[PDB]
Amino acid sequence: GTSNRDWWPNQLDLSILHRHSSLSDPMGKDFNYAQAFEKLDLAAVKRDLHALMTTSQDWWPADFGHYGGLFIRMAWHSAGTYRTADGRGGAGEGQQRFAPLNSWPDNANLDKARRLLWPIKQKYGRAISWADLLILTGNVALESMGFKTFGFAGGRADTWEPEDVYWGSEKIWLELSGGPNSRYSGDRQLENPLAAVQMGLIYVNPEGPDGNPDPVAAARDIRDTFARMAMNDEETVALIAGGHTFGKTHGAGPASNVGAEPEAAGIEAQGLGWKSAYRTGKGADAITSGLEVTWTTTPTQWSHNFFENLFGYEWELTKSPDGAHQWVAKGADAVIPDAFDPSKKHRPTMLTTDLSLRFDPAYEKISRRFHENPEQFADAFARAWFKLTHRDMGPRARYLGPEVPAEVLLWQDPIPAVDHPLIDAADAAELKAKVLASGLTVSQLVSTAWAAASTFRGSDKRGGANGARIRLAPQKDWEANQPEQLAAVLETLEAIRTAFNGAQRGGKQVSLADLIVLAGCAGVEQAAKNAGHAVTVPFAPGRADASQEQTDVESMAVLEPVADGFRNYLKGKYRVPAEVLLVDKAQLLTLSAPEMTVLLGGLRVLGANVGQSRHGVFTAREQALTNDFFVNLLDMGTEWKPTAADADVFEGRDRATGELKWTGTRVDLVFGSHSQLRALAEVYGSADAQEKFVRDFVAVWNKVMNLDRFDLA
């Protein structure tokens, strides 16, 4: 069946904006997962999980009689797809059960782990999501084996279809670097937004970089990929040594024995894959990665034996039964247990990437400190495991249940509690009137509130106007935010705020976070008024102001908009067309095609463009909220041509006279070009659409203002 994607493989793809519709969701329109989970008996689930760890199923027998290691791995892979660049991946939507992740080679045999959990999923039904369950099971595994976790939060709602994520351009699973779709260039520079060394891997190659077993050079890939998952050196050592305190790898026989991954398997396989022809195909004969390493003398118990071994022996290169490179301690006694035969013991073994922890000079200092002080190791791994498994969950307001840790961590971008009465509707009207009387313009008001709110991304639920981080480093200095104009606006708003708070009785006060958003509302209302329309923009107070000390400047860097088509802004020259970056930003902001369309056409005529550019400002009444963008864009009396100086800027000229009327960018003109976007623009550019345009603009404006307001959920 030949498709549009085949005929026009470079057209913009809008279907990413309409995933996760009510059509695909089996739960009713009013189903609220938070409410279901809040009544779950979490202790009873955990008791069932605890029992499961030692209840072996014959179709996938438990190593050492304990599934703990398999489930830690499952839970680390669920969380380990996360990329700080865009917030995509991570455990927060249970995407390991869908394509492509369910069939990545690094997820081999995790289908078995998920199937072992079906009886418990089934028992508790909608009260616990798959997404939550994968992580909870990892925690219970750790607890059952003697490790004290840092806590657990529920609240990850299930999704019902694959997310659209750019995982790379390679067309071959696990393809070595330097091919025609190489994710590397320069001196081993991995392209953004990617966070793994090869297609279908979580982070790095366990044999070493493109299979070269050099622990020193493997360390470089480890450090780079972990950093791209937001983990520093201490957290990376803790997590890798922590995880490899448990279980074993599986490489009993040659990998040519292993059949089709789950999405390619026969229907009879009932969602499982990697069926193996090697001996029994499972248990003692299991093949997963092709490596055959067991790290500790007690694989089903927390210990400090990973570092005891790593430092206590000298290591020699050897090959597994699939020919993969790995390491053995030859001077050692056979002290490591066999997973199925009580009369067999084995020498200690390590992966190339484990030895990275000892032979990279920076990691060795951390590993030594953890070796000498296993209490510090345990605390670091607990904190890192929590961060790993929660990093994409959003503000603490989304955390559910009785085990949420009370310690507030800097990586959570914390927001102080509000301990005072909020402004009411009358107070909000008085504040809007003072904002408008200060002389701040519609353009300034709208640009500032847009700049504060539009940092939100739905992928990990970071960003948004809550916190007033726009006044702090680094957001106050981001080029897109127009640092000098921003500073002038914030100074006037802060004087309004000081006066208003100073006049109050009884504890009432307004945060700068709320006032920045409310001021933006007043600019939209004024713009509507300038066009002859009386509207009220909704506004919900309750944001609080975060301090500079509560704001990790380096972690904020990924939220900088380097492309924001809603402000006609491109920080530099990119390989990806500007219109594709626009749909990418729309997806992160959780907007549908119609909402992206209304919003951008309004922002254009309100003066939200960076630098006061005229590109796309197709109106003679700037700062009035009208549908002028669409009416003028779609006017066939105007002819458009790329400029001689810049092919990404277009001149719109009267077709008869040649007079220059407008200029625009690819972001502006795609609304007149793309067949679906133009059909949208036509709705808003029709003679009967002034009221609809205004109402829909206000609704999406309000939606953007509230994206991070999980305190009102």
Q: Is 341 in the site for a second copy (CB under 8 A)?
A: no
Span from 15-23, 51-59, 79-87, 316-324 in contact with Na ion (CB under 5 A) = 79-87
Listed in order, strand segments (DSSP E) in 521-611 are 563-564, 569-570
Nearer to a second copy, 49 or 490 (CB): 49
**DSSP label at residue 29:** T
Residue 497 binding target from Cl ion, ligand HEM, Na ion, none, CB below 5 to 8 Å by type? none
Evaluate whether 377 touches 367 at the Cβ level (below 8 Å).
no
Ranges within 641-700 binding a second copy (CB under 8 A): 641-642, 650, 655-656, 666, 669-670, 672-676, 678-680, 682-689, 696
Q: What is the rounded distance in angstroms from the CA atom of residue 246 to the CA atom of residue 239?
A: 12
Nearer to a second copy, 122 or 343 (CB): 122
With vertex at residue 636, the alpha carbon angle to CA 630 and CA 638, rounded to the nearest 5 degrees, is: 90
Evaluate whether 156 touches 132 at the Cβ level (below 8 Å).
yes
Q: What is the rounded distance in angstroms from the CA atom of residue 408 to the CA atom of residue 355?
A: 34
Span from 34-42, 202-210, 357-365, 662-670 in contact with ligand HEM (CB under 6 A) = 202-210
CB of 95 to ligand HEM, least distance (A): 18
Evaluate whether 195 touches 228 at the Cβ level (below 8 Å).
yes
Residue 163 binding target from Cl ion, a second copy, Na ion, none, CB below 5 to 8 Å by type? Cl ion
Using CB under 8 A, pick the residue from 597, 609, 663, 706 that binds a second copy.
597
Q: Is 541 in the site for ligand HEM (CB under 6 A)?
A: no
Q: Which residues pair with 23 in a beta bridge?
A: none
Position of tokens 């994520």? 165
Nearer to Cl ion, 195 or 698 (CB): 195
Ranges within 383-402 binding Na ion (CB under 5 A): 392
CA distances from 710 to 180, 471, 549, 589 (A): 44, 22, 23, 15
Burial class (CB in 10 A: 0-12, 13-18, 19+), 489: buried
Residue 8 binding target from ligand HEM, a second copy, Na ion, none, CB below 5 to 8 Å by type? a second copy
Ranges within 40-99 binding a second copy (CB under 8 A): 57-59, 97-99
Q: What is the rounded distance in angstroms from the CA atom of residue 454 to the CA atom of residue 469?
A: 12
Evaluate whether 107 touches 173 at the Cβ level (below 8 Å).
no
Burial class (CB in 10 A: 0-12, 13-18, 19+), 687: exposed
244 a known binding residue? yes
Contact pattern from residue 137 through residue 176 relative to Cl ion, giving x for each residue in contact according to CB under 5 A and a dash for the rest: --------------------------x-x-----------
Residue 23 binding target from Cl ion, ligand HEM, a second copy, none, CB below 5 to 8 Å by type? a second copy
Span from 25-33, 84-92, 437-445, 475-483 in contact with Na ion (CB under 5 A) = 84-92
DSSP string, 251-319: BSS-GGGB---GGGS-GGGTT----B-STTSSGGG-BSSS---B--S-TTS--SHHHHHHHHS--EEEE
Span from 122-130, 247-255, 525-533, 696-704 in contact with ligand HEM (CB under 6 A) = 247-255
Nearer to ligand HEM, 246 or 697 (CB): 246
Ranges within 128-187 binding a second copy (CB under 8 A): 130, 158, 160-162, 166-171, 181
CA gyration radius, the chain = 28
Catalytic residue among 66, 77, 325, 371: 77
188's CB contacts (< 8 A; 6+ apart) are 209, 220, 221, 224
Evaluate whether 427 touches 510 at the Cβ level (below 8 Å).
yes
Cα-to-chain-centroid distance, residue 302: 30
319's CB contacts (< 8 A; 6+ apart) are 325, 326
Residue 673 binding target from Cl ion, a second copy, Na ion, none, CB below 5 to 8 Å by type? a second copy
Nearer to Na ion, 391 or 497 (CB): 391
The two counts, helices (H) then strands (E), for the chain are 24, 12
Using CB under 6 A, pick the residue from 117, 127, 131, 240 that binds ligand HEM.
240
Count of residues interacting with Na ion (CB under 5 A): 6
Span from 242-250, 573-581, 602-610, 632-640 in contact with ligand HEM (CB under 6 A) = 242-250
Q: What is the rounded distance in angstroms from the CA atom of residue 606 to the CA atom of residue 190?
A: 39
Nearer to ligand HEM, 73 or 156 (CB): 73
Pairing of strands 316-319, 189-190: unpaired
Q: Is 353 in the site for ligand HEM (CB under 6 A)?
A: yes
CB of 71 to ligand HEM, least distance (A): 8
Q: What is the rounded distance in angstroms from the CA atom of residue 88 to the CA atom of residue 90?
A: 7
Ranges within 49-78 binding ligand HEM (CB under 6 A): 63, 69-70, 72-73, 76
Using CB under 8 A, pick the residue from 199, 287, 428, 449 that binds a second copy.
199
Nearer to ligand HEM, 241 or 512 (CB): 241
Q: Is 460 in the site for Na ion (CB under 5 A)?
A: yes
Nearer to Cl ion, 88 or 183 (CB): 88
The token duo for 56 is: 């072996």
Task: Say whether 20 is catalytic.
Answer: no
CB of 264 to a second copy, least distance (A): 6
**DSSP label at residue 645:** S
Ranges within 270-309 binding ligand HEM (CB under 6 A): 288-289, 291
Using CB under 5 A, pick the residue from 109, 320, 459, 609 that binds Na ion.
459
Question: Widest CA span of the chain, in angstroms?
Answer: 94
Q: Which residues bind ligand HEM (CB under 6 A)?
A: 63, 69-70, 72-73, 76, 203-204, 206, 222, 239-240, 242-244, 246-250, 288-289, 291, 353
Annotated binding residues for heme b = 244
The residues annotated with a catalytic role in the active site are: 77
Annotated binding residues = 244
Q: Which residues bind Cl ion (CB under 5 A)?
A: 88, 163, 165
Q: Which residues bind Na ion (CB under 5 A)?
A: 87-88, 90, 392, 459-460
